[PDB]
Amino acid sequence: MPLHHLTRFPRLEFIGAPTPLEYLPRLSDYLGREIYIKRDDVTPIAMGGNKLRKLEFLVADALREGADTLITAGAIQSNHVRQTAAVAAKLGLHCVALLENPIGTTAENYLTNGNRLLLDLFNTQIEMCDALTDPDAQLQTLATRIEAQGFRPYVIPVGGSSALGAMGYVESALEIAQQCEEVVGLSSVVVASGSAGTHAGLAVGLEHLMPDVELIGVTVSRSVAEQKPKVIALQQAIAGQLALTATADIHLWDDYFAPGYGVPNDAGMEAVKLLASLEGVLLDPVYTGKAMAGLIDGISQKRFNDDGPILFIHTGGAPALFAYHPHV
Amino acid sequence: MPLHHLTRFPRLEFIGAPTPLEYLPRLSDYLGREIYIKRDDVTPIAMGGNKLRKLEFLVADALREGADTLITAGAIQSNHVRQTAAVAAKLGLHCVALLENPIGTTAENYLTNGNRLLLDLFNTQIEMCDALTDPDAQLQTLATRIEAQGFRPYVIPVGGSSALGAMGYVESALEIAQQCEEVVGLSSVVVASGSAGTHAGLAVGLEHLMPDVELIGVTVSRSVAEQKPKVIALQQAIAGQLALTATADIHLWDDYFAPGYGVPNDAGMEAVKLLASLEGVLLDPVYTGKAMAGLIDGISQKRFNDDGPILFIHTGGAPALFAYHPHV
Ligand SMILES: Cc1ncc(COP(=O)(O)O)c(CN)c1O
Numbered sequence: 001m002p003l004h005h006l007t008r009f010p011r012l013e014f015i016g017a018p019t020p021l022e023y024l025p026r027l028s029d030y031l032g033r034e035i036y037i038k039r040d041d042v043t044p045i046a047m048g049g050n051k052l053r054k055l056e057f058l059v060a061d062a063l064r065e066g067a068d069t070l071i072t073a074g075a076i077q078s079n080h081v082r083q084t085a086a087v088a089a090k091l092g093l094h095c096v097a098l099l100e101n102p103i104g105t106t107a108e109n110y111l112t113n114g115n116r117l118l119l120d121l122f123n124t125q126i127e128m129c130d131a132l133t134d135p136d137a138q139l140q141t142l143a144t145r146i147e148a149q150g151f152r153p154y155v156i157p158v159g160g161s162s163a164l165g166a167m168g169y170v171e172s173a174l175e176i177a178q179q180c181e182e183v184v185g186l187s188s189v190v191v192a193s194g195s196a197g198t199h200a201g202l203a204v205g206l207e208h209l210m211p212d213v214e215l216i217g218v219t220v221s222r223s224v225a226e227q228k229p230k231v232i233a234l235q236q237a238i239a240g241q242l243a244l245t246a247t248a249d250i251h252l253w254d255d256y257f258a259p260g261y262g263v264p265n266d267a268g269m270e271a272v273k274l275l276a277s278l279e280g281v282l283l284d285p286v287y288t289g290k291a292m293a294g295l296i297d298g299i300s301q302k303r304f305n306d307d308g309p310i311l312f313i314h315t316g317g318a319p320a321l322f323a324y325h326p327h328v
Numbered sequence: 329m330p331l332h333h334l335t336r337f338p339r340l341e342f343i344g345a346p347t348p349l350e351y352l353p354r355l356s357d358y359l360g361r362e363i364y365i366k367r368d369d370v371t372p373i374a375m376g377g378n379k380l381r382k383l384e385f386l387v388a389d390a391l392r393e394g395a396d397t398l399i400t401a402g403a404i405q406s407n408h409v410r411q412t413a414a415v416a417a418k419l420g421l422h423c424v425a426l427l428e429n430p431i432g433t434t435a436e437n438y439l440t441n442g443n444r445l446l447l448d449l450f451n452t453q454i455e456m457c458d459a460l461t462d463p464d465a466q467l468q469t470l471a472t473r474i475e476a477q478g479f480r481p482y483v484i485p486v487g488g489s490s491a492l493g494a495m496g497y498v499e500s501a502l503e504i505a506q507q508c509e510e511v512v513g514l515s516s517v518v519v520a521s522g523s524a525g526t527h528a529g530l531a532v533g534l535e536h537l538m539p540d541v542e543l544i545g546v547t548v549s550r551s552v553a554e555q556k557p558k559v560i561a562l563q564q565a566i567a568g569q570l571a572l573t574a575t576a577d578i579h580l581w582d583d584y585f586a587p588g589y590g591v592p593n594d595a596g597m598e599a600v601k602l603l604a605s606l607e608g609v610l611l612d613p614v615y616t617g618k619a620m621a622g623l624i625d626g627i628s629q630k631r632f633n634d635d636g637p638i639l640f641i642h643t644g645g646a647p648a649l650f651a652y653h654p655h656v
């Protein structure tokens with residue numbers, strides 16, 4: 001393969017078989033476009049999601065360093081903190097989570113239910129902060145405290161979106177390419193774009209495996225101006241570590257996340273209702289509902305390169321449905 | 329070979345590949361015994377569970393008879409209603425759910441979060457009743473009213489547990505035999521025993537594929553005296569349908585569900601905490617927490633036939649964690 005360098009990296013096995021790639025016949029009949037879905041929401045640990053693919057690489061690295069503790073950061077309802085805390089429990093590592101409340105809510109289900117409930121079941125040590133103004137710096141400061149309490153911490157950045165963690169999405173792109181050879185004319189792929197490892201890993205893999213496909217990131221927290229340089233830097237870092245070329249443009253749509261990270265919106269929630277009622281698929285208010293709202297509007301406004309099939313990357317997130325209900 | 333008549337029943341494809349069968353090393357270390365887990369909680373539709381295995385057969389049968397509406401019953405937080413509603417939404421079938429509040433709670437997360445919240449996403453028609461005093465009669469009365477609107481209803485009993493729904497768990501037993509072949513010599517299998525389709529279908533399959541394995545049902549709702557005839561009637565009806573005999577004794581432990589169906593207990597809670605903290609695995613207060621508290625106590629009191637490996641069937645249930653929090 002041109003991606004054989006992927007095999008050099010130590011990785012734990014958290015997923016196993018390739019997740020399903022399915023046609024959505026009802027959604028496709030409704031929108032008048034062929035739509036497929038990559039089910040990375042079915043990864044098998046603690047209600048699943050896209051970060052288990054990153055943690056395969058990140059946590060192998062932690063064990064190679066002989067760490068006994070994983071430290072990461074996110075919102076109170078972060079799916080990434082959730083998955084990290086579940087993998088720590090599975091492997092008998094301590095977990096420390098630096099959390100913020102990004103939306104100033106006092107609603108009890110946001111503060112205590114959904115992913116935050118699961119953190120307690122996993123004996124995660126919780127450190128609250130007023131704001132994740134500089135997450136890398138704050139995690140480093142924290143890790144140095146914890147190391148001085150007798151532990152050996154390993155720091156996973158927000159979203160696990162380092163180049164190493166993003167190799168999980170180069171892996172997802174290999175599965176996608178294998179599964180789409182039985183999909184005449186896949187034109188576009190749509191994914192939420194936040195901390196950017198998913199988007200950037202897909203970007204590097206799909207450039208090599210499926211070069212005619214257009215990868216669109218629907219932003220969940222930032223403008224195209226603020227987000228593009230982030231995704232490009234990661235794209236280049238991953239491709240460097242794989243000794244691959246990466247010249248593809250990064251495409252981002254920023255119209256779908258207002259009024260901010262972590263705040264549900266109407267088109268988001270209508271997309272969650274559409275996917276649940278037509279296909280029995282569960283999206284989420286923060287990431288995948290907004291990304292799907294984007295895919296749907298892309299159809300409406302003819303925003304894609306052509307009218308051909310569209311593959312949606314389901315990255316997970318559905319446990320937050322229970323935290324966001326009935327409102328925040 | 330002896331389960332061959334199983335291929336005669338039409339069945340839809342909901343599950344796809346065999347679900348994981350995993351060793352639990354951290355729980356095995358704590359309990360002093362080899363514990364493996366069959367991950368039927370990762371079946372890929374709408375948060376998963378044991379009922380997708382029965383719905384493959386039941387919904388195939390609905391479609392063959394030209395039915396366009398599924399009608400079933402359970403508690404407000406039933407996982408079975410939730411799975412049925414999701415498969416209905418996926419196939420463009422109407423779904424009507426007769427629900428009761430079995431525990432008399434007014435707690436808002438029980439009334440409106442968890443599985444209950446998912447049903448509204450799947451456009452389920454909800455029919456409340458005061459109590460499921462005669463669910464088969466009550467479903468028929470409902471079906472008469474629904475047919476009067478021009479719908480073509482197919483009634484699925486509580487839990488899906490007819491002999492035909494049970495065939496899902498005869499199939500499960502084939503998977504488990506294959507997965508354990510030349511990998512582990514199982515001694516015992518533990519599963520929750522409620523409406524009894526899972527218990528009975530495993531009983532038939534295991535008697536024929538792994539006749540020396542002891543299968544233990546842990547009741548979730550009834551004493552041994554009240555539950556055993558239900559499991560035996562299914563067991564015999566399933567065997568009848570497959571042209572087989574089933575001479576095995578049904579085994580049931582009833583010490584772990586008090587004070588009743590859907591009421592959490594301390595040992596259940598402690599089993600949920602142990603599995604999350606040691607293995608990153610999520611159980612549930614109604615079914616699997618109680619079945620795992622039974623497994624634990626079975627080991628503590630030497631209730632099993634020997635000291636050999638035990639397979640726990642994880643039948644799902646975790647969305648209820650969000651409905652039971654913070655209390656009922
Ligand atoms: C469900 C879900 N989907 C998408 C994303 C965005 O993935 P990325 O962080 O790789 O941009 C996340 C981030 N935690 C997520 O949790």
Ligand SMILES: Cc1ncc(COP(=O)(O)O)c(CN)c1O
Nearest residue numbers: 487522523524525526643644645
């Ligand atoms: C999670 C869970 N586990 C176990 C059971 C009991 O299975 P059965 O009805 O086949 O006895 C149920 C019933 N719906 C369930 O939801």
